[model samples]
Target chain A: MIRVACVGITVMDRIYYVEGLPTESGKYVARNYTEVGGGPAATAAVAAARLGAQVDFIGRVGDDDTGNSLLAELESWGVNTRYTKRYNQAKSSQSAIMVDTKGERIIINYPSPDLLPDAEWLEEIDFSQWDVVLADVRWHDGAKKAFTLARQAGVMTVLDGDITPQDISELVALSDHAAFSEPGLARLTGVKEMASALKQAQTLTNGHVYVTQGSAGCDWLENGGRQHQPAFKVDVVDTTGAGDVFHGALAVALATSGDLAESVRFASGVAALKCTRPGGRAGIPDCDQTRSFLSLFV
Target chain B: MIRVACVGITVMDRIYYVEGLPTESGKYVARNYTEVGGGPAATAAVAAARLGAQVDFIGRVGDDDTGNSLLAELESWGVNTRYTKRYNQAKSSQSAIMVDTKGERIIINYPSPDLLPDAEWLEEIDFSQWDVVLADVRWHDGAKKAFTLARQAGVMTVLDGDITPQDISELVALSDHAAFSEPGLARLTGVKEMASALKQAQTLTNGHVYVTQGSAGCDWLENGGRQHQPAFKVDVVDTTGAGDVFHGALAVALATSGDLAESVRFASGVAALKCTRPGGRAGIPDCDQTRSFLSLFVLEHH
Candidate 1:
């Protein structure tokens, strides 16, 4: 099994469904309510775990009840959280997500002010046995340190470049595989066109560069040529965690297959399957399930 | 019994009590939950009706389920809603209020955009029989018209000046009794100093003017002189509707008592009593209750 490590913030998500926002004055009754454990890195780790990968999750949880619940969730998901810290004064991160019928999420996220200092803990990662290190930018300093250690130890690192667009030189330097949103790719590579952007990113990193373009599919630069992969067409419900799903799928494929082209195709299939369901990781199919989905896509 | 009209937005207030607002990516679970009928005017009207007044509520309610419940509540409280329009297309308004243990409320109110025109059916009010016309600015044009009609018909009008400070000219012109917050009073009278602001508002209107500073008590200009009343200090549980209660209580006093200073004191007493309890209209007591509370301020100890 591919051993993958996911690191970032984890938050308790409270989701509400309402008719519409009141404009003048009044109270809205909730039609539906859902609660879930969520965050960029948490989502990616869960995606890999559901895909049958051996996973390690690193983050901080408040020492409060919510933190206890989150710890229990991570344990139940078979994620080793030996790296996750628990703080007495810091509260667990949370979000009040209002999801419209069209699957758009208006997320009001609150990250605790009492965050973990990266310098002390990040330098402690033992990267000898890890296959791939995946990270979200919520904890960039930690990710930077972890990725550096992983690279020195010959383990591959993939950076979720959505929230970390500002730390270009450091991120692209440490990561062997970099995935960015179309806009993120454009901003980093300074090329407006997707194909040109991919070429520019590949030159900048000389490892692997990919841009996920939602339904328009993903394009990459490799082997002195550009390759484009079309997304599997499916009725979309909640595309909330599709990007994280893509990163998880990509990291897993890298650890298993050892082929970049085949990896993107697998990641694309997994992300496409994710959009067919509601919420992030709500109906994450297993490897068998992903294979079944790939058969239909084929 | 005084007959008062309370008008504005009505909503089902669903509140979640938590320690504090969430940090950027943090989440805290709610410890308690409470749901009730809430709105500036609707709660005020309920407060008055509970305090032994014949209260009539005027506004629009969506024809949906929550609206039906609000309508049923008014009927239960003896609030006549003969003038409340039930629009088929509009949905009832909602507020997600977060109140902490400190007796502070952060109200996230959603007001429906489609409102009935100002002149649709309100002109039929026989203002001579009404005790007070207390209006909220949720329906600005209608509030202006209501205040204007009440002024023309020789009735006292109390306008809560909160929403649009820029429209203070029209609001001040139409209002007989203008009570505002510090910022609102400043914008209305163009005077930065609190004393000068009250004097300017008094100069603009025939009736007395009040600049209500929450908890700091209220200062007013009546009969070309300044008078101030300290807020009655009571244990505050929730202050969600204290201002609305004050407006309602003030209207009742100004309309019937015929003495502006006594009215201000009565309003202050009622407001102080309101802050003592939680929720809107939940703590609003009767005239006797107001009188008994007023006894605390008198020199009876001597």
Candidate 2:
């Protein structure tokens, strides 16, 4: 079994299913409502754990009920929360997400300002025990510490890069496998085209670089050449955590098999399976399910 | 001071301020967000308490953190929650409300299905201690018990009539004053016109019957004659709890002063003040403020 450590922020998401986003200033009713766990790294941790990996999540949450639920959710999905920290000075990050009938969403996040960006807790962990370490750009201070320790231990480091542009260069430079969302890759390299951006990202690290474009599939630069894998055709009920699932699946495949092309194929299948269901982590396919899904295409 | 008992429901409301209601299948972002305590009777209790009335709220909430905050909020407003019950068998009612820039709102509520509508706890309460009893149609079993006890003690009874037309006639017949929101009145009487509806409502209750229309003000039938009070001109921030505030103030004023016209004026003033600020009870004016507002228009009050 591969031991994967996920480090970053965790959030509680309250989602509402509405007919459409509000166009003018007026009241709108939601068709349905649900509460779920969210955040890039936290969700990815669940994804990897669900796929039969030994996963541990490292993050800081408030000692509030929201934090307690977030930690519990990860544990329920077989992710070890032993390294998860709880702080009374800060409340857990939460968000209100409104998803339209077409699966597009608008989010309003409430992140506690009191949450410190410290990673002193990482100093006490044995980084060499983990096979792969994944981190998001949400907590740069923590990501830097964990990535540095993983690098020293010769453990594989994967970065979940999306939307956020802050500290991208440092995070990209630190990871052995840097997988970015379309917007994130575009922002980091200042190149709008995926091909151009992947080319520029190749110079930032000695390892492989990949970019995930929805529906268009994934593109990567490896072995002094560029490769493209088309996305699987699936009904997208909600695309909330597809990229996060892809990163997690990619990390697990690379750690367990060390096959880049095969890992991308496995990850693409997992991400496609994710979009067929609603929410972020709820749609995550199990190990057998992913294998079966990939078999049809392979 | 009048001792008022407000019995009904309590809810945790998460409010969002958006540009407009979604008319198409697309995502929309909210301008702002807030959380507060809401419900007809609960907010009314807060309104009366802020106006120097001795108010006690009678309701049931879950034994969760949401319930704890709801109780704390009523206490902060000087409303007594000694009779507010907490049960582990039920989770508190909650809602997600979206208020657009024009102050119009749409709400989706989640009330625990396990919440027992039982009011057997009322058997232990002393109805004579309360001078006025106000209840909303949300909890019929509890309202019936409370109103029955208040009637025996000769205490004034007011019903917050809205939406639920199931037992409107019965609840109205059992009250001394019954105030209805515009849509509620229309629904209950099946009459679209305010004049016809107000007249029809009078048949259901032997006591005074009134209908509240936004901006058009309030119209009522009392003492075999109809009277109209025009709404106060003020900037409306949020209209979520305006009617609830009016009912609370009306109950308090009727109990303390026993003057119909004067009581309506005071209630109107308090409700107008509520609209000047956001949220339900945040803008509730004190007794002195209500008096001063009424004094400006009526020299006879002072």
Candidate 3:
């Protein structure tokens, strides 16, 4: 089994579905409440785990009720969470998520006081043991250490650019892949044009670069080649964790298939399969479904 | 000296000027950042402290950088935060507040786990020493305990109804005076009618009840008598925390002046003066300035 290590923060999503966010100071009853397992790396770990990859998650949660819940959910999803540290003092990260009728989400996130461990903790993880190491740019110190360790161990490293540039530029430099949201790419490279942003990101880093532009699909530069795969066509009931699924599928395909173009197409299919459902991890499609969708399209 | 125990979570506000909130995944940069002290009771306490009253603050802060800045700022503003607990396990609460040109603010608040404290920690404060107490409903267990101690000791208690009615209804029963924001009143009483909400609230609690309708003014029911205080007109800048200034000034005037009617007028004037400036505490007019402004319109002050 291909071993994949995902490192980042974990959050408890307190989702509220509203007709729309109120335009004034008023009480608008939520359409529903959902306890979705979320966070960039955590969500991607679930995506990879569901797709039949050997995975380990590294993060911190408070020793509170929510922290226990996060741990319980991660274990149930089949993601190896033995590396997760539950601090007794800090509270688990949470978000007040408001999803509008049109499948848009506005999040008010509370960061965990228990930050990811420093490089000392990094020394404990044997980076050479994993075939692929994925990290999100939440803990700058830990991400820098992880990126360096993975690079030194000759492991393929991918940086999850969930935030803006200042957060991930250094990590992106050390990684084999720079994966980012469209705006995150733009901020990293200072190019507003979508295609130009991807090009500039590739120029800024030594490795392949890609910008996940949601329904517009993803544009990437690899091996002196560039490809823009169209996002899978779906009604998009919920796109909350589509990008995470795409990254996880990309990880699986890259680790095994070793074909960039095929990986991009496979990831797009996984993300589209994700949009068919309403919540985050609950949205991920199994390997069989993903392979069938790809076979039908190809 | 009259003593006040004002309690609530205060935050450092990062105000952004935007045309509107983004409807898509597009990025937005704030036109400007204005930092201010927040929370209802926190601001009220600062205002009373400014009026030269001995004030105590009972709340929680994360043992972080921003929390340190907040503690220093509160002290400089004359608020006694000796009882405030700093939790090492949480991040300081911070907010990204977006305000349009039209004076509407959309706030994104992040409350850290460090901000909520244990119930026993609140029991250390002696409520009988306080002449007046004001609190928010966020710290449910602490606020309820404080209310039990204060009400039993006959310390005059005031409540700021900024949260959900579900958060404040039971606490309101313990209040000697309870004031609600227009929306807060709507949530608590389950009635849209302001009169009906005040009527229902007055019936439930032994306290005087009031609902502050911004720009339109305030309505109150005391001893089965209802009264209205029209807002003192002023040039408005950023209206953030103006209501807090009103409540703080109201607490100050009520604690000293003994006349509730005159105190309401005084608070309205102080809050109106606050609107003419920027930020919450920065805008609070001093007692002499307030007296000067009142002299231009009303009669003698004893």
Q: Which stretches of candidate 2 lie over 4 Å from their true place?
A: A15-36, A82-85, A97-107, A119-132, A140-243, A254-265, A268-283, A293-298, B14-36, B96-108, B118-131, B140-243, B257-265, B272-279, B293-302
Better of 1 and 3 by lDDT: 3
Error of 3 at A48 (Å): 16
Interface RMSD of each: 9.1, 5.3, 6.6
Model 3, range B135-232, lDDT digits (tens) per residue?
A: 87656666777888888888888887764424577888987778888877877878889988889888768888888887778899976788999887
- Model 1 residue B129 CA deviation in Å: 3.3
Highest-TM-score candidate = 2
lDDT agreement with native, every candidate: 0.74, 0.83, 0.75
Native contacts retained per candidate?
Answer: 0.03, 0.28, 0.03
lDDT tens per residue, model 3, A98-209: 5667666665555654654554676787899898988887656667888788888999987777653255667888878778887677677777897767776776678788
- Ranking of all candidate structures by their TM-score, best first: 2, 3, 1
How do the residues B1-302 of candidate 2 rate in per-residue lDDT, one tens digit apiece? 68999999888887767677544432234566678998889999999998888999999899878899999999999999999888886668777776777777765555555568888889899999999999998788888899888899898999998766265778888889989988788778899998988888998877888888866888999777889888887778777788889999999989988888888888999998898777788889998988787778555432
- Please report the interface RMSD of model 3 to 1 decimal: 6.6
DockQ of every predicted complex: 0.06, 0.19, 0.07
- The stretch of ten residues in a row with the least summed lDDT in candidate 3 chain A is A22-31
**Which regions of candidate 3 fall more than 4 Å away from where they truly are?**
A1-22, A25-103, A106-298, B21-27, B297-302
After TM-score superposition, the amount by which residue B14's alpha carbon in candidate 2 deviates from its true location, in angstroms, is: 4.3
User: Cα RMSD to native, each candidate?
Assistant: 12.0, 5.9, 9.4
